[PDB]
Design a protein around this ligand. Structure first.
Ligand SMILES: [Mg+2]
Ligand SMILES: [Mg+2]
Ligand SMILES: [Mg+2]
Ligand SMILES: [Mg+2]
Lengths: 716, 713
């Protein structure tokens, strides 16, 4: 009864998003110039969407066929299901943004008030947020119902052996497939799309300074529009897909841990083997993350509703944070009752790591929540010019360009410590409360209100497009200032959301490492003590070698992406010169850059997906565990570094735009130094960091799936 | 046998004789003498300042190390400190004395040969000092505290008055290693802060109203930077290679010592040692003899090169020295390994897969591993190859393009040498377990004397060319010195890469030694697989890994900021002096500021294991060590390769290879910006990480005996 009521929440969120979509669609359109700019934007965005979707479908079909040949067929079906859910969320969000980009500015001009434009923008972003949440949890509920309970995969819970000889718990491999689908979608989006985005931005500045002499924010400059399209591609599709991958990864990790926890804690008392953790407890913990995520999504919808109906205010950041805090607190309170009432009558929780009984995992989840917000604040502390580091960078701008670059690198390097220490304490306490299951539950709670987080993240690029459109149409300077204010708010929210995404990616990747270690269980370890099975020895030279290899592969991944951005930008500059030699060609250059980025992403994608396969069939599962540990560590550090450095450089340029630095204004030599630094930092913050967030999770997912094969089938 | 124990002081006397020989070489013109006198003054002043601070810290640490643990540990700590400081001081004095003699040979003879011989002998002083002093201290420890006091005879878990348990000889060699590490940390961290502050401030004053050319004797930072070159590529790199050398040897010794209490079997009421005392002592002594043979072969190669008929190709001569030393070590250590371990029993329980010859197969691997790693450092930094060419050519696309391509180059460059390290570790393990991993580190550093000599050759020739041009010598002679300088540049890139690789190997060996030192007297009956274990599913280990990585990155950033601050302070001091040249004044101001800055990175590196272990335990410290090593290796390789690539791309455009642009052109301006960014990265961050990844491991190895059972949570 109540269970089915919770299972309706996904369609509730889908209908909420659809209704908000329709409501905004009804909002007034802009002037003919506004409409022409929006039409260019929409054309480029939809074209990019279709272009990437083709390759996505191809790769998804190949991977689904492979997942059906090996493992089970339900694995590939759930893979395709998750792929479809994530692709649907992204497409819906991007179409909504391309339709509301001008409506925000129309509210700002017609009403001459911040309130209405803010509410329109928040509904626009809430479309993508509710889509990312709803499609994901809907597919996951379907998986737990169709392939889960109906087919008795939650009933068997034994080591199923397929025709090839690959061993696995059926539901574990199923949820692994559902996660890998979302991961393929997110990888394509973030990696390739981001290469495109930063190619567009860079080439925009370039053609601004090329022989064509067409500065950025120029309607004639095709990259001016392409960059807007890329901004939506990134902070609406990319960031949404990343948060979806982390969310689904946390849930799937919890489910996998419980599923494999059923065969692990067994005791060969005599000739027979008793399950110390009964089936009831295993099923309860397989379902608890799903119910927790549903309650979180409901609370997120409640917060979104309050903010969209709340009396208008003057601080937009305040309203967005109000949404965040309402969702967080409601999730905390309701999930407390969920935890205590759903796990009370279970047995074996002590053997599991639950230190305070049925309520132990909730203590974990709330921790993650706070961890999340804390990490967010850190991303704001090291990037905003309201605080000391960015102020110091902007001030040192007077001392040269090399000093700007060095101080930005120093800031990025030092910025990794506060959030990483936050992660350290969060992991320690979540473990203390409820073992690795609670580590996963802390990852989940951190993302328990993912809908509002994605909505606030997607609000940013909407305001960016709004300010760009307004400036290009030369509206009233008052309206331009309104858009500037909203743009600044969106920039702050984007920094906070990117930091939150990095933290969530680290948590999810660690949860997936734990799921890998748990999935290494074989039918021959039934009598062995649990300490013998759940083990990755760091003295084994294979593990150290794998760790070094994983770190190096992460760094090489980052470097290749850096080079790819510049190559795509140079090719787009050549295309723009050709267009000048022969209303410019918007979709033409956008499709050229999109195809080049999708062709370039092939090699980083092949790295991310095949590194565990190659290294595992070559040396085994300890080596792959080492690779995962090194990848997670180096990717966490590099992502934090690049994101914070790029944000600091950009916000220091903005600091100088206001002239705060010793009266210096636009055009001064320090401003040129900061601009050079910002051109350096753009690909780091918008291409490298998110792709590392994706890497550290997708490699773990592929390892979790394929270890069932190469654990015993390895050459050396 | 005794001859092997004599080899260290043989190398010391070889270095003294080379010192005397070069000192007798002609000085030169009065201007040469004045500039060189400024150099010598600054060098001795910096040496004295750092030596004073070193003495203070060393006395404190020795008292602390004697109060806890044992007294011999602190005694060996001071011994190693003294050995490394002696090596550094001797090498720096020799280099500052031979800098002008090289140019005098080049001018009087108008030939490359004699100047090259003078410079190489000067560097061989520092190399032979590092080798002789290190192996001398180790022989003294193995003889006095080793056999005489019977510390190699008991080989059982001694418990001190406080209750701290450990094998005595392991703790003693750990103390000696910590002493070498304190010296190397002071050298690298503080000296490098000073060097890059000086190099930056020289460029800075270049653009003031004072109109102080970067190569002008009036510019004090010119001289400070000339001195800093010796501070860095003679003292810093020498101390780093010495630390890695001693660390590999000590790791082998610790593993061997702790393998005796590990492989015991409670067959009945008694405990039988599956690995007998004879085998354990033989494996405790084998690394020492291996290193002695390596130092002997290094001396032979140095002698061959210094007596060889003079030639015109310097790079060929240096590579000849390296290869002769390598091959001689290979063959002689082959015979040593086969004859010294043949009649030992229980090698199979230790990991020796092919019997007595197993560790040699490991050692040679390290050797090869070494040279290969070197090549990679040259491939990604020299403009003779594709990456640096691409960077220099892309200079035309802007300054941001230069910076982005340099970062990309470093990031991608970290992969070939790390894969080399991966394969080397895998094969060394296949041959002889973690003991052979340590033996591979040793073989990689088996000819450390020759490596340090080639590394110290560079700065000697750099200062020599500076002296020549600054004194306006014959343009032909100046061009000759410039050529020698270029050879030194390539060798310096290769040596920095080799040092990073050796630091990684030594840090991994020290991690293995830490895990072995975690043994307690209560785990004597437990199977060996249960004790020698660091589970990565333990959340404390993962948390420690994240913490160590973050601490590494914060370390790097703090060093960058300290370099910039010290450079600005030196510029302020030079302005004050102009308003009211000051060579030793500004040099001492920068030295004191760098020594004040080093306090926080040193406190990080030394106190992180103590705090985290007394707080959370030994698994957390193992995690911290793993994360520190993994992140430091990557960051060191990245920063070093990026700085080298930027510098050689600037050289590419200055060399006009990219036709259409000369000095002053916009692409050259971009390359100069890139080089100013890369200087602190390659000359301060990378080496300091090399030190960090080892010294944190050593402090952990020592203090785990306390905080393994004394931790709050
Ligand atoms: Mg723009
Ligand atoms: Mg804009
Ligand atoms: Mg930009
Ligand atoms: Mg941005």
């Amino acid at each position: 009864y109540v269970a089915a009521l919770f299972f309706l929440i996904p369609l509730v969120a889908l209908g909420f998003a659809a209704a908000n979509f329709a409501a905004v669609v009804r909002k007034p359109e802009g002037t003919e110039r506004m409409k022409e700019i929006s039409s260019y934007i929409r054309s480029g965005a939809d074209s990019f969407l279709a272009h990437e979707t083709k390759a996505i479908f191809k790769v998804a079909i190949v991977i689904a066929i492979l997942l059906m040949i090996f493992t089970t067929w339900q694995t590939g079906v759930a893979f395709l299901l998750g792929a479809v859910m994530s692709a649907s969320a992204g497409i819906v969000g991007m179409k909504m943004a391309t339709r509301a980009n001008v409506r925000v500015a129309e509210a700002a001009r017609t009403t001459k008030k911040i309130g209405p434009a803010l509410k329109v923008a928040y509904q626009g972003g809430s479309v993508m947020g509710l889509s990312v949440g709803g499609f994901a949890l809907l597919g996951l509920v379907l998986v737990y119902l169709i392939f889960g309970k109906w087919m008795g995969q939650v009933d068997n819970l034994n080591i199923y052996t397929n025709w090839l000889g690959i061993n696995f718990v059926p539901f574990a491999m199923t949820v692994s497939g559902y996660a890998l689908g979302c991961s393929i979608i997110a990888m394509f989006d973030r990696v390739g799309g981001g290469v495109y985005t930063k190619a567009a931005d860079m080439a925009a500045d370039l053609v601004g300074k090329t022989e064509l002499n067409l500065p950025e924010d120029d309607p004639r400059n095709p990259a001016t529009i392409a960059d807007n399209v890329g901004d939506n591609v990134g902070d609406v599709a990319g960031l949404g897909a990343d948060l979806l991958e982390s969310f689904v990864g946390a849930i799937v990790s919890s489910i996998i841990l419980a599923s494999y926890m059923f065969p692990i804690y067994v005791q060969k008392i005599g000739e027979n083997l008793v399950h110390q953790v009964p089936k009831e407890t295993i099923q309860a913990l397989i379902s608890y993350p799903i119910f927790f995520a549903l309650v979180g999504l409901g609370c997120s919808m409640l917060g979104i509703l309050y903010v969209i109906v709340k009396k208008p205010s003057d601080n937009p950041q305040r309203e967005l944070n109000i949404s965040l805090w309402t969702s967080a607190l409601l999730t905390v309170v309701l999930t407390a009752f969920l935890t205590y009432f759903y796990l009370k009558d279970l047995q074996g929780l002590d053997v599991l790591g639950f230190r305070f009984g049925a309520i132990s995992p909730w203590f974990s989840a709330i921790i993650g929540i706070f961890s999340g917000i804390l990490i967010g604040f850190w991303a704001e502390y090291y990037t905003s010019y309201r605080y000391k580091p960015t102020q110091f960078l902007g001030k040192s701008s007077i001392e040269g360009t090399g000093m700007v670059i060095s101080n930005g690198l120093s800031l990025g390097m030092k910025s990794v410590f506060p959030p990483t220490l936050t992660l350290v304490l969060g992991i320690l306490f979540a473990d203390y409360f409820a073992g690795l299951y609670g580590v996963a539950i802390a990852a989940l709670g951190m993302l328990s209100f993912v809908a509002t987080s994605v909505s606030v993240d997607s609000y940013g690029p909407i305001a960016d497009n709004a300010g760009g459109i307004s400036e290009m149409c030369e509206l009233d300077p008052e309206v331009r200032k309104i858009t500037d204010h909203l743009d600044a708010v969106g920039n702050t929210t984007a920094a906070i959301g990117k930091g939150f995404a990095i933290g969530s990616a680290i948590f999810a990747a660690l949860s997936l490492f734990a799921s890998y270690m748990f999935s290494q269980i074989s039918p021959s370890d039934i009598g062995k003590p649990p300490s013998l099975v759940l083990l990755l020895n760091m003295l084994d030279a294979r593990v150290i070698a794998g760790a070094l290899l994983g770190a190096a592969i992460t760094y090489y991944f980052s470097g290749y992406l850096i080079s790819a951005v510049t190559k795509a930008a140079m090719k787009m500059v050549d295309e723009i010169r050709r267009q000048a030699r022969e209303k410019p060609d918007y979709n033409r250059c956008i499709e050229i850059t999109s195809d080049n980025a999708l062709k370039q992403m092939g090699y980083p994608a092949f790295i991310a997906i095949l590194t565990p396969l190659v290294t595992g069939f070559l040396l085994g599962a300890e080596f792959v565990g080492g690779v995962l540990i090194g990848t997670v560590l180096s990717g966490a550090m590099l992502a934090i570094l690049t994101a914070n450095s790029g944000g600091a450089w950009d916000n220091a340029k903005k600091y100088l735009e206001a002239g705060n630095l010793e009266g210096y204004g636009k055009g001064s030599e320090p401003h040129k130094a900061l601009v050079i630094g910002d051109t350096v930092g753009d690909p780091l913050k918008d291409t490298v960091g998110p792709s590392l967030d994706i890497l550290i999770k997708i490699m773990s997912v592929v390892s979790v799936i394929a270890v069932s094969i190469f654990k015993h089938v390895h050459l050396f």
